[PDB]
Each structure stands twice: as C-alpha cells, then as structure tokens.
Amino acid sequence: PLHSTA
Amino acid sequence: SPEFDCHLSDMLQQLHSVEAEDPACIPIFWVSKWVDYSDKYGLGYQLCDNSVGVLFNDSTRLILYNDGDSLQYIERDGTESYLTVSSHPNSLMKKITLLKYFRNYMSEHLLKAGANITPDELARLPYLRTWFRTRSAIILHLSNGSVQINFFQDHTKLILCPLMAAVTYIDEKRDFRTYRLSLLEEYGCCKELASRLRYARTMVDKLLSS
Numbered sequence: 001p002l003h004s005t006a
Numbered sequence: 007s008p009e010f011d012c013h014l015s016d017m018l019q020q021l022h023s024v025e026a027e028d029p030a031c032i033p034i035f036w037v038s039k040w041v042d043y044s045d046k047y048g049l050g051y052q053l054c055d056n057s058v059g060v061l062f063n064d065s066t067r068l069i070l071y072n073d074g075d076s077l078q079y080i081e082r083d084g085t086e087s088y089l090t091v092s093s094h095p096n097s098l099m100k101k102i103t104l105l106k107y108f109r110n111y112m113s114e115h116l117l118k119a120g121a122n123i124t125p126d127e128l129a130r131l132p133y134l135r136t137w138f139r140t141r142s143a144i145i146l147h148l149s150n151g152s153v154q155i156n157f158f159q160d161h162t163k164l165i166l167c168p169l170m171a172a173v174t175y176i177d178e179k180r181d182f183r184t185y186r187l188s189l190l191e192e193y194g195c196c197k198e199l200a201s202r203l204r205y206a207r208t209m210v211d212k213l214l215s216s
Contacts, residue, residue: 003041005117005161 010151011214013168017187018210020171021203026189031172033184034129036165037146037154038119039112042139043104049137050108051146054120058109060101061134068101069133070109077102080133119156119163123174123182136213145209153213155206164206173206175199 039052048062056072067080070091079087079098089095094102132150139145146154153166165174174184177198185195195203 001158002043003111003116004039004119004156006115 010149010168013151014153014210015214017166017168017171018207018214020187020191021207021210024187024190024195024200024203026185026193026195027183028172028186028189029124029184031167031170031174031184031186032124033152033165033167033170033172033174034125034127035132035148035150035152036120036123036174037134037148037156038121039116040144040146040156041108041111041116042144043108047104049134050105050112051134052109052112052116052118053131054118054123055129055131057131058105058112059133060105060108061137062101062104066101067133068098068105069131070105071131120165120174120176120182122180138212140209143205143209145213147213153206153210155202155209157202162202164202166206166210173199173203175202 036054037051038054041050048060050060052058057070059069061067065082069078075091077089132148135147135149137146142157144156151168155164160178162178163176171187172184173187174182176182
C-alpha cells in the first residue's frame with residue numbers, strides 16, 4: 001500500500 | 007551523537023533475550039498516519055499530536071507543528087530553520103505545497119493509529135530519521151530513538167522505545183498494551199507478541215547495519 005489504513 | 011543508535015543496539019540485544027504491562031512506559035509520540043509518495047516526492051506522515059512531517063527524496067525535512075502554522079525545515083547537513091505557512095522563502099513553496107497536500111489526504115481519508123492510547127515528562131517533537139518497507143511491513147525510525155513497525159496484513163503495530171526500554175503493541179482489535187522489555191525478558195510473552203518481536207529484531211538489525 002501507498003498509504004496507511006483508510 | 008551515536009548514543010541513540012547505541013541505545014537501539016542495546017534494545018536489540020535485549021529483544022534477543024526475550025503481567026509485563028506497565029502504563030508508566032506508555033509512549034508520547036508515534037506515527038498515526040503515513041503516505042508513501044517516494045517515487046517523486048517523499049514520505050509524508052502524521053504524528054499522534056496531529057503534527058505533520060515530510061521526509062523528501064532530496065533528504066530534506068519539513069515539519070508542521072500541530073498549531074497548523076509553524077514550520078521547521080531541516081537541510082541535509084542538519085541545518086535547522088524556522089518559518090510559517092504565511093511567511094516563507096519562495097524556494098520552499100513546492101515543499102510547503104506538498105506537505106499541505108499530504109496533510110489534506112491523511113486528514114480526509116486515513117485512520118488515526120493509536121487514537122485511543124491514553125495520554126508529565128517533557129514531550130519533545132521528533133522527526134522521521136529514516137524508513138523502509140518489506141512485503142510485510144513499514145518500518146519507521148524517529149529521531150527520539152523510537153522504532154515503529156506497522157504490519158500490512160493484520161494492521162497490528164509495534165512501537166519500540168529504547169529510552170523507556172519498552173514495547174507498545176497494537177493488536178487487530180486496536181487494543182493497545184505497553185510492556186516493559188525487562189519483564190518480557192524475565193518472564194516471557196505470548197506467541198502473538200513473541201513472533202512480532204522476532205521480526206522486529208530482524209528489522210532493527212537491518213536499520214542499524216543498513
């Protein structure tokens with residue numbers, strides 16, 4: 001993933 | 007000073023030797039949100055105090071305080087300068103623009119990790135010293151010595167503090183538990199924590215040896 005948890 | 011990394015190596019040594027909970031060891035700072043734009047721009051992050059930072063590809067750092075206005079800029083050689091959203095050099099416009107974009111994205115879309123962690127000792131704002139990724143995790147090394155490991159698959163997290171000689175574990179149910187490493191060394195822990203601490207040993211070794 002390119003970001004932390006949405 | 008190589009003191010922090012020596013404390014980190016000391017903690018690594020302790021982890022190799024590993025009712026162990028202690029609320030006096032609860033961390034003050036951790037990474038609550040992050041965005042990886044490292045192909046072009048860098049890594050943006052939010053700390054649990056709502057401050058936002060970026061470690062840019064050019065090895066410079068920009069930090070926005072939780073007042074949403076104050077900025078510290080750290081150049082590659084470590085030179086520190088201070089500015090604000092409204093009062094800044096033109097050369098920093100793009101970096102400020104990017105920080106605000108990252109801030110907006112994290113605020114709009116992302117969960118705050120450890121939002122339920124309960125908040126005396128002086129809280130000194132750290133920055134992201136370095137970071138790296140594996141297939142299984144992102145590893146985040148803060149300037150205060152702390153190492154945070156976020157596991158992608160089950161959303162479990164470790165916050166390792168060499169100064170407090172402690173580990174905070176956030177489980178799948180988002181419950182947090184803070185352990186004294188010496189009590190883990192003396193008495194042992196569950197396989198749930200043990201398995202993640204084993205992986206942490208490898209990650210910290212990687213960090214230190216680089």
